Design a protein around this ligand. Structure first.
Ligand code: U5G
Ligand code: U5G
Ligand code: CL
Lengths: 302, 302
């Protein structure tokens, strides 16, 4: 038994991380095939950061202003390009450690493993959720930019996030690997709002299912509810409205616990309404929304 | 900014995990040099498990009863040995992916990265603390046995845990890599007590320091305390008694926050005494004791 925030093994992604220096700025790059991907603001000075014209700024840059290092090895850039908010640096060598990979754009409520790097060196790995407001709550210091988020499905790495910037609270924004920001963010040092974040209701139910499977049952109750009734007690508490896919996606967990999704929704209502009263579920004194149904199935089966 | 439970990158350890089958039992092995290490209870039947004589049970086993697989490759065992509660299977091939490594026995209150495996395949990575009672709170299903816990210092893997068994609550016990159990546990399916677990006070202070560094200050208070006075309010609340090394180890964090350790101890007392009143510190509604001072320094500096 036991239930933990667990990241995918990071090995396949370690061999893809390089260092990228342009002028004074150094940060992380993803080297797949003959292409290093990194955030385009590696070309900015402290000053440019306030209101950059990236086209103009990049014109002043030539292949030899881009210092790509892979441990001790340096890579000949033979082509620079911009795709939205990322730099593609075409290099001479194909990364021999290149894994089967894809670039996917993940949807709000989905999770992925971040391999946080500094100077092209991986320092650690943890799981994030894409929040409904398209922020993440990570651990990213100066130098962390260009670190990536990924899923491993089969033997195939699905790259879905690259880190760009930090927002007031301590929350992170970044791009997919084609360089489109998740959410309304631009790579400019100028006031931008994240706006209201809500709880991923289906993930909270997935987690209650994980609780029951590990024996934590105390919150399980005699009552039930309707979808409408509950979903009016959701929005009250800023929770993503529960749909019928959400029900059908909890099937495997409903199936394994022999607990109907709507019985479980009624246990949630009383915790939203009566709090947790100083009790814990799975070592946590609050409701956890950063595990998907699949995250729970993967961990609670094998 | 940001502060997360972060595991070391798992790559160096992925290339060391093999499958080990004896009779019906299959579990995980650590292949370093010409030696595969695994739990010795791979030789037991469901029945043997209740009261094994390992010496006697192992005599009936010969090199060819041990089926070691590394993905699709099979390894010729040319020597079986028992060191306390682990099997050393001498094989023909030296693991070419063998990293600089050491075997260390970690002390209660220290943390390490678990790479959880099934059938010799890594499925995920997370951080654990060796609890004061020498249990961990992991995520280990049938097949997880032989999964290892490690630190990466410099380029050198320090192997410190191998998973053997689960204790009532959902808590895990295992050995160092010489095969000595942490704590009073024996590899026999017979009633054993963990007995009373206490909170790693120095780790809770390290975490309050991480909070302050990320801006969460509300619990910071005007008061101070003595070491004796606080340490009498510790044991009340089952907390490891705070020593002067603990003070001197918090130096780097005291140094960076400009907050004396004993001011911080007085903030802790009021949270132990007045609870958290529905507020959160670093996204948690309870006091976190599974980050060491070094874990916090590593993450909060680079
Ligand atoms: C990286 O680029 C890096 N080199 O690691 C860096 C990581 C952060 C954490 C300290 C620096 N990110 C940025 O520098 C990022 C780049 C400029 C400014 N950036 C910010 O993240 C800024 N945030 C910010 O301005 N936020 C709001 C936009 C005003 C909402 C910081 C204030 C955190 C520096 C750009 C192009 C946004
Ligand atoms: C592994 O050996 C494995 N193959 O993965 C396994 C993992 C656990 C999780 C389900 C099985 N561990 C054991 O089988 C372990 C081996 C026997 C019995 N084991 C237990 O962990 C048992 N615990 C237990 O008996 N606990 C107390 C000791 C009575 C305190 C289980 C009941 C969990 C099976 C041995 C040699 C202890
Ligand atoms: Cl919590």
């Amino acid at each position: 038994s036991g239930f933990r925030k667990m990241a995918f093994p990071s090995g396949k992604v370690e061999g893809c991380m390089v260092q990228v220096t342009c002028g004074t700025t150094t940060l992380n790059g993803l080297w797949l095939d003959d292409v290093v991907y990194c955030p385009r603001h590696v070309i900015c000075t402290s000053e440019d950061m306030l209101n950059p014209n990236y086209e103009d700024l990049l014109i002043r840059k030539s292949n030899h202003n881009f210092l790509v290092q892979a441990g001790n090895v340096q890579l000949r850039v033979i082509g620079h390009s911009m795709q939205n908010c990322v730099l593609k640096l075409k290099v001479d060598t194909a990364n021999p450690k290149t894994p089967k990979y894809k670039f996917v754009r993940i949807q709000p409520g989905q999770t992925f493993s971040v391999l946080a790097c500094y100077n092209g060196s991986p320092s650690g790995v943890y799981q994030c959720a894409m929040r409904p407001n398209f922020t993440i709550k990570g651990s990213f210091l100066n130098g962390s930019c260009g670190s990536v988020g990924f899923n491993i499905d089969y033997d195939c790495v699905s790259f879905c996030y690259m880190h760009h910037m930090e927002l007031p609270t301590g929350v992170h924004a970044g791009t997919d690997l084609e360089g489109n920001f998740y959410g309304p963010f631009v790579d400019r040092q100028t006031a931008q709002a994240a706006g209201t974040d809500t709880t991923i209701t289906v993930n909270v139910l997935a987690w209650l299912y994980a609780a029951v499977i590990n024996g934590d049952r105390w919150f399980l109750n005699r009552f039930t509810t309707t979808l409408n009734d509950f979903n009016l007690v959701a929005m009250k508490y800023n929770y993503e409205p529960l749909t019928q896919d959400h029900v059908d996606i909890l099937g495997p967990l409903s199936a394994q616990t022999g607990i109907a999704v709507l019985d479980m929704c009624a246990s949630l209502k009383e915790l939203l309404q009566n709090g947790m009263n100083g009790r814990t579920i799975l070592g946590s004194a609050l409701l956890e929304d950063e595990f998907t149904p699949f995250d729970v199935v993967r961990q609670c089966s094998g």
